[model samples]
Target chain A: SHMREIIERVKEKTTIPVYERTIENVLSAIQASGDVWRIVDLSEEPLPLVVAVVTALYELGYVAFENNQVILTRKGKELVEKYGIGPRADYTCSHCQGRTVEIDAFSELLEQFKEITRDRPEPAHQFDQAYVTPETTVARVALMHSRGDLENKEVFVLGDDDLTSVALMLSGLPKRIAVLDIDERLTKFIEKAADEIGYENIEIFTRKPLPDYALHKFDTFITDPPETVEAIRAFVGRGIATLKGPGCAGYFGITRRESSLDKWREIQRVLLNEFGVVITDIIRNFNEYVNWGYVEETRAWRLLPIKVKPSYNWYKSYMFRIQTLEGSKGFDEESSTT
Target chain B: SHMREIIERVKEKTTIPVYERTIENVLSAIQASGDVWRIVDLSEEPLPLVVAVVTALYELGYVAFENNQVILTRKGKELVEKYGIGPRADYTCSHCQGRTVEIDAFSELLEQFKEITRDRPEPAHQFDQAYVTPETTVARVALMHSRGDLENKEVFVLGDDDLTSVALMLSGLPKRIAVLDIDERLTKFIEKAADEIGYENIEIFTFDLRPDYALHKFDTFITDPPETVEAIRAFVGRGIATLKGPGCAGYFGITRRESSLDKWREIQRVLLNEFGVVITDIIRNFNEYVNWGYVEETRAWRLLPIKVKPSYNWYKSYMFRIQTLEGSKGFEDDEESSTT
Candidate 1:
């Protein structure tokens, strides 16, 4: 072929290679596992998500791997020879929220988060039965800190399944952080992470009921509360109890799927009128959950196109931030009914 | 400080900077926008996403920016004075899907894609209407090429509003690409994109009841067909109609929200137990749409947590791949009905 033909051919095939980092994320994950399909970090030859997907070829007896290295079995090489690893890894993806914060040294960060969480699947998600992955928790912390909410603020959490309390503690930004949970497991896990990391500001308590101990005491509170009016009222009302006074704020995750507009209106009325709190921000689909599959809505996984882990976390919850009226005292305990 | 005290202090704060790539993706987008209520970028100092989030602080009169620089109108300087640009860009991000092919020299590619699809959002997502951004369509083209599926292959598209047929043509891959669409606007738009890019292997035709003109002619077909039994059969059947015998796979976008286990089983039944097509792969939440609010399921946004656009992409669709049975001739068109 003529040189011009070569240039034109190269022009025909070239793309901006946007998925470079995503591939490296996986390739590094495998390499960090010290085991790889050799999918990423070729440093010379370039390929797509083809090798990370060689796992499928593994189930088919076409490939083999150990200590992080993928070796093509006779059948594997033949299959590759016959049917090349298809273009890219588009199998699973996160919903585009229109913004991504560059966490420089993210590879190291992921390893750190993994090390902190220790990949412990224990302490099952319980607060109204939901689990938010730790990475998602860290993102929330980073978001809050950037917003200046975490700068020297005493924070309170009504339900701790998402475990941002530990993440906030990890950052050393908050003046003080506390989490209330019914389960000893979560409380213990948060405590262990905080203590192990030497986070001095983080405090965990296994409160049976709402904490009367810290009434009207905190600057901010966050929760993924139960959808029912009673659960939200009780949990949010308990959260309001911890706020020092007006100007303090709270974050809540409420899904539109379960709660109706009428339900939302009633909840808003109580929040705005009863507690003197006004909505500050509402970001849709902010909290994406994994165990939500075990919940009512997604039991139909057999019908799902791709039943995968981590990325297949299809459940999304909307985030709401509400601020109390200036000088507004929420539940002095005298006016509050438990 | 005591040795234990020093050790304890070190222990308390530990966070890994993960997904640094995601940070830059957001930062660049903001920098590109030129006016984020307040934002990030600069070599010496680094910060996190919360800064880009100052749009929320806008109501309080806190920030400002323009043409690749943030003015930080009020408290903006205070924010930068304290925080700086912060840490780093990430290891991986969404756009590249891992293998970032440098088309930096290919300024023509972005222009070709942008110039071709003036992106006049129309035809308004009638079949359970939801709209996916055009950038995503281009990504699909790059993905297919990387998979080795696009080089010199003839392709058929059941619906062309995404205008990927032009993107495929842009790659200079796929010997021939054809799109069947009910929307004349889309058909005309795709043709213009192909011509503008000087791509020769592209074909476009307005779908008049069915695609009888071309049968069993292409190696691949991609579509986000309707959810119901009637819609999936008709659309998938139409897509299958354009395939060349066996090993010719098809791509379908099926959302878990609307179509349930029963709905999926019924649709899969028709394809496999009936059509000699077997499911090869199903990718979850892969096809994200921007404004699918028109679908009856989403009309409740007036009562929603946040009702808006340029971001509120509520519905997500899963991608599906189906392979035709080997040597199994496709589409005996004589037996099919439009409504069935």
Candidate 2:
């Protein structure tokens, strides 16, 4: 019941085999939100099966849409119960025990993925040479879709220094999941992928610190902002301007590994007092990356008497869902976001 | 209210300052277990409140003990509904976000607590000097009491090097809690505290690891073992041998600050394979210590250019409750816990 086989049966057979990531994403969203989530967006999905899959699942009595949100039927819940979205398929890692999330039997899609986006995007240095597994990116996309955050919404990606916009478009979910990046390489590759997918909803506008056109329009935002105050403001603060008004949210990933609580305290102060958004949830240990190798990993402790730091994909980012309050102070009025 | 204030009121009359730790402990245990917990043991509280409190709550239509478990009444559920235990009272911490638990104004109890245990027990060096805050100790005690694990159970302390026994005794709970230690100083100090408090349920025994008398037939076990494989075996393993039967558990504290999960994996192997015990839960950051003074107070980090470490009460231990399944291979079993 993977995405590949389902696509083969229902849609025109294509070389790009289907992956169940979209369906799995909807499932994960429902489970993660504790059976309370009721919205899923398929506009961002690149797959033509966006409507096909929803309609089929609805016909199968596994789904329903009421008041612009995808609410699961009792049958859907039973299906979820029968096959949970837990990471049990992956081995339980000790380093990130309880948080280390890994992909399951989705390696083929990943291999083809690595092929399409060959020579993984060279992560900028200021962003700490960040690298989130493509599968992790896909997972985030699915989470956004399940929450109805990315579906049918204009998602402003702060900097797709990585080609997540390509992944989002590939998901066939976001309404106009656009990428605004300073890097030319990302846009070029994404544009090429756009030509490949043949769906032109992705709005690409390149600006370094963000320009007037990319401000105050999107319903949601998503970014893996650099782990710095200056960079966070440049990236996160700028992304805040893209959102239209209250009830708007953005997905963010920040880690406690390199950043301290004091850093978090400052970030929270900015998000709460200045931007006026409350962080709704911290999906713990949601994203597992090639841990941006900590110092101890660099050839030390081999001959020296040092404790070997555990490396169980423990380097993870705390995923956040921050919603702006009704009377949020806009970034344009920002005097203290510096 | 805190069992401390309740005890003070029963002993005196000016209305002891309300603390609410015990009440919160019951509420915390009930809530933390997500209402899956039905049983509680008050047999540990040495205070007359063990009976008085439960009866009062029962009379107040808040609680009922059916079998060996404490089941909340319909009114009790309504009471719980009114006041839920959200850790939001304490400003959430960073090192252990989502697990950084804080107390609700127990600093007053802690201020004088520091006074009484002024010359705090000298933590052994190899054991990596560990001292959980007094309020943290009280919180642990209240948690155990609310769980039915400590109350009325015959408990053994494999190492009272921390004088947790004194804290438990002070709560006026535990039918007959005792301490066994290699350190006579700890035993002597605990003995003197017992004499000061009177109501001698505090039994003392001296054992390098395990003496013959302290070996079998205790309902519960609680200990803060040294963070070493051999020490863990000698301490944590030896402590497990003292428990009575099918329904007993051990409260253990092992920290990732020093011990890696690789080691915990080995420990779990030992507990599961060698001892037939399964780790029921790991209450993360349940015990916050001053990280045993990493830089400023400790003599090592100061020598290095490490101005980077944030000064928070970050050194913490995850609390574990391990219970035995049927057909356990006892301490007498010989197998390598270092299984691949």
Candidate 3:
């Protein structure tokens, strides 16, 4: 059934018209642990089925054919690596919320799994050891607490992602985690995740008009805003306004495609003008996978269970460390105000 | 009355309007000894009148206005020298018709004649003695015979003026003289002149197509052909053909107006092609008059006479000598015709 389900989903996702039975053949090959006959072997079939399949793959962004060989593209590999093995579903304690496994297990896996998809996948375990192993998330959280100076900080997440927020909650690092979103549904989802994570410091709010009350209240703001200029500007503006007096920093994840160097410079210009703060450093993780894709075999079939790891596209996240000057006054006291 | 008569005659020949008084003034000046102003004072007269008198004197074959003086140009010095003064002339048979003069008598009166003309004219007589003397038409024909190899040669003359043909007859040199003309009257005049000269060798022929037919015949052809290319071509062509086996020549007396180097070369080309001949040499002479002026009573009077010296006016004569030779014969002729 699993083989049937995988073939059905591949067919549904590919929609290639050459071989209605190609999905079945590929699935049978996968189940039998043998190589699938790509469209190249369709010469005996009517009308050169390989050309049609290759054309479909090229149009659907599935496989790239060069020199008569079809290979999974970066996007295709990422989809297989992330969701091909099926989704993970489990419950955790409201206070810890799987952090005991997430932090420690992910950290140990970060070591044992040398091919972390941080650069490129060579050879690595295809299992979710983050939850099932002796290396628990709690130990990794404890390690972060010992090394990081985030005890009394105001933390923020621009998107409603719970894994890292729950880890931060169990670690008791930030004084507050301001979860902001324009969509009320995402705000409610973040609020529920915050409740399940059992964090008293978590705050959920929809983005509102300015004269915001949280200006200069946070020492550090962790942001992962939507990849749009307006959204990035608003998030960075709010982050700067809510930052604490001096030596404060912000960690933000920005895709290289969505935010170019010029866009970052413009963001820095705005930050400098509004907060009177200069960016001291930008920590870039150039090799990191930030998203995944799902594939279905047929129109009626469920998604398949095949995991694929994507290539590192470009700089994934930028952590900007900014500081206010020792002698600088607050905004109201700056005499050159226009 | 004399002025009226002269003016009538002048007006009859010309349609030009002239005041009677002005014509009378011109007549009086022409009759005067050397009055130059009476003629030129009427400067408002049309140019044709001035040109007519000038050209008429020129056509009469005298050199007038040789020195660019108007008094002598209007007066009759050139006509007197050429046609002789008076109604019936009596002098030497050659001098009777403005042909000859006694050298001693001319020398004795030379100073008196110079004083009469108010100044000593350049010694024209001395100048003529220094150069070839101008002879009468008859004398010139004798001179041609004396200078040329004419005894056994056939000769031809185109445009036979009576005087020139008669002179040739008197020379008794050419074995035959073919006198050709288009006008029967002129041909008759030539025949009459030939008979009067008692030449039995003369032949007169009238031909409308003489230029084409008579181009190659005579050993010596004397021609004053109408200065046109057609006429000159005929004369030159005949001269080429008429050349004797050796020592043959052609003499052409052409007016300056009709002669051009290009026309001469054209003639040469035609002659050479027809007879394979070449011109040995060319000679040119001017037959203009010298004008004299006398200042009498604070007025200038002018006189002009024919100056027949070689340097007078633009008259030229050319004598060309040709030789004939046998060219290469083909092999067939060489084999068949040669007698060893």
Instruction: Tell me the TM-score of model 2.
Output: 0.37
After superposition, the stretches of candidate 2 with alpha carbons farther than 4 Å from their true spots are: A1-338, B1-112, B124-128, B291-310, B332-340
List A-chain TM-scores for all predictions.
0.60, 0.59, 0.46
Interface RMSD of each: 17.2, 21.1, 69.4
lDDT of 1 by residue, B1-340 (tens): 2223322332232121212222222333343333221122221011212232333333334435444444345454354334332322232234432222223333466677777666644546343334465555655664454333465678888786666677777767677888877877777877777777777777788865544556878878888776567778878877887887654668777654344333444565566545656453444344556554353333232222222232344345555666564433344401111111
State the lDDT of candidate 3 residue by residue for A272-305, as single tens digits: 5444554433322211333222212221112112
- Whole-model lDDT values for every prediction: 0.51, 0.53, 0.38
Ten contiguous residues minimizing lDDT sum, candidate 1 chain B: B37-46
Every candidate's chain B TM-score: 0.60, 0.61, 0.44
B166-260, model 2: which lDDT tens digit per residue? 77776665678878877777788888888987848778986564356556777678887766566666666766788765446788886544443
User: Could you arrange the candidates by DockQ from highest to lowest?
Assistant: 1, 2, 3
Q: Cα deviation of B164 in candidate 2 (Å)?
A: 0.9
Best by TM-score: 1
Interface RMSD of 3: 69.4
Best by DockQ: 1
Where is model 1 chain A poorest over a 10-residue stretch in terms of lDDT?
A329-338
